[PDB]
């Protein structure tokens, strides 16, 4: 069996205490990163699944084990795909991480529990976000079905169907699966192969990398004369990387505190690539790879590198402090428990603008009709156009309003 890395990024959405990590575990086997130094940087974890098919019935086709002994046929499984999971939490406080996750995602998985109430605002918000950020491949999954009645589940399904009609997602498949009992995952696997294809990707496009997580490889007990370099957990959308290249983290860093800053973006040479489980020479875009570079282990510690752009040497993108946005607003607010009408944008107000993966606070200067000018506090970079989600404050915490695009 060949040790091929991740091909396409699949993300999972839900709610707090509903069950997402458990579902992930059921799907794959290797436990999630979340659940001080290691793993702790963002809200998303790290998981990997296997797609191997046995074609020699009905729904039973794909499996989780490398060896086929369970269904009947003793023959070895055929290699189809290998996928990486991006598990994003569905909490009312933390959403920036989710947004960041969304930017890299190519496939989405919705989770709704049976026993709880049918209309949930957070789930709706998530769906809206998915719709916004160039995602159409959505599979609806029912979580807790075993604790529900014979007709109640059907009713719930009907309600769901009624709800999802006017949205961009038209032909979304619905699967009921148990997380604690471990059943019906084969159908899900089959669907993964059926409904979702891999988009065309080539070597010709300029390298662009997005870092979500940060890692320091330091072990207690062992002497200091045996050290390991700083690892940046970064996912790639476009551009193939190989071992032996120069990488730079774009936005900038503060090194001296009197004296104006002039220091260039953080340069680092690649030491070792961590994909799936074992090290590989080539990096195929469409997965999260722990890129171990010559960067400090102290820098890759905690909340320092959350959603930052990474480029290869011989390419020049632009850095902006003032940004030109083309926005579109929604009718009523999504996320609030009660629904409130969206007000027109007022000059000079603190609003959270999420350009791809960056979590930045911006203030409005001029409003016309569709075009808006924003002043940023923390530095941000622009490459092409980018997919932007906008968030405002009305009551206590952040609420989503609509979508935006950079006009440059």
């Amino acid at each position: 069996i060949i040790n091929r890395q991740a091909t396409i990024n699949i993300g999972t959405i839900g709610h707090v205490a509903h069950g997402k990590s458990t579902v992930v575990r059921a799907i794959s086997g290797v436990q999630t990163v979340r659940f001080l130094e290691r793993n702790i940087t963002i809200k998303l974890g790290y998981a990997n699944a296997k797609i191997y098919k046995c074609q020699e019935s009905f729904k039973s086709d794909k499996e989780i084990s490398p060896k086929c002994q369970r269904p009947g046929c003793p023959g070895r499984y055929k290699l189809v795909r290998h996928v990486s999971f991006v598990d994003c939490p569905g909490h009312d406080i933390l959403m920036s991480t989710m947004l960041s996750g969304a930017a890299v995602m190519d496939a989405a998985l919705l989770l709704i529990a049976g026993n709880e109430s049918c209309p949930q605002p957070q789930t709706s918000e998530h769906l809206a976000a998915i719709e916004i950020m160039k995602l159409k491949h959505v599979i609806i999954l029912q979580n807790k079905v075993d604790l529900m009645r014979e007709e109640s589940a059907l009713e719930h399904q009907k309600s769901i169907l009624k709800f999802i009609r006017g949205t961009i997602a038209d032909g979304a498949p619905i699967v009921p699966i148990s997380a604690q009992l471990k059943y019906n995952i084969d159908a899900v696997n089959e669907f993964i192969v059926k409904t979702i294809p891999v988009p065309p990707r080539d070597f010709m496009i300029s390298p662009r990398l997005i870092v979500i997580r940060s890692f320091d490889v330091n072990k207690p007990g062992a002497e200091i004369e045996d050290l390991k370099g700083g690892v940046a957990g970064g996912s790639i959308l476009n551009g193939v990387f190989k071992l032996g290249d120069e990488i730079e983290i774009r936005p900038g860093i503060v090194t001296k505190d009197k004296g104006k800053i002039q220091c260039k973006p953080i340069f680092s040479n690649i030491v070792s690539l961590f994909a799936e489980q074992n090290d590989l020479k080539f990096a195929v875009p469409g997965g999260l790879i722990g890129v171990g570079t010559k960067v400090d282990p102290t820098l890759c510690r905690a909340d320092r590198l959350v959603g930052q752009v990474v480029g290869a040497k011989g390419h020049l993108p632009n850095i902006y402090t003032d940004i030109e946005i083309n926005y579109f607003l929604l009718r009523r607010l999504l996320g609030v428990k009660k629904q409130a009408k969206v007000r027109k944008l007022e000059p000079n107000e603190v609003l959270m603008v999420n350009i791809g993966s960056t979590a930045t606070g911006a203030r409005v200067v001029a409003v016309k009709a569709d075009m808006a000018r924003l002043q940023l506090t923390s530095p941000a970079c622009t490459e092409i156009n980018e997919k932007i989600a906008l968030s405002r404050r009305i009551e206590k915490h952040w609420r989503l309003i609509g979508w935006a695009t950079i006009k440059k």
């Binding site: 009905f58 014979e150 059907l154 498949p173 619905i174 699967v175 009921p176 059943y183 019906n184």
Partner: peptide
């Protein structure tokens, strides 16, 4: 389209502890 879901549901109902 909501047609092969029913069969799956039935199967789930059948296979339980």
């Amino acid at each position: 389209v909501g047609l092969p879901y029913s069969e799956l549901l039935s199967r789930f109902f059948n296979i339980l502890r």
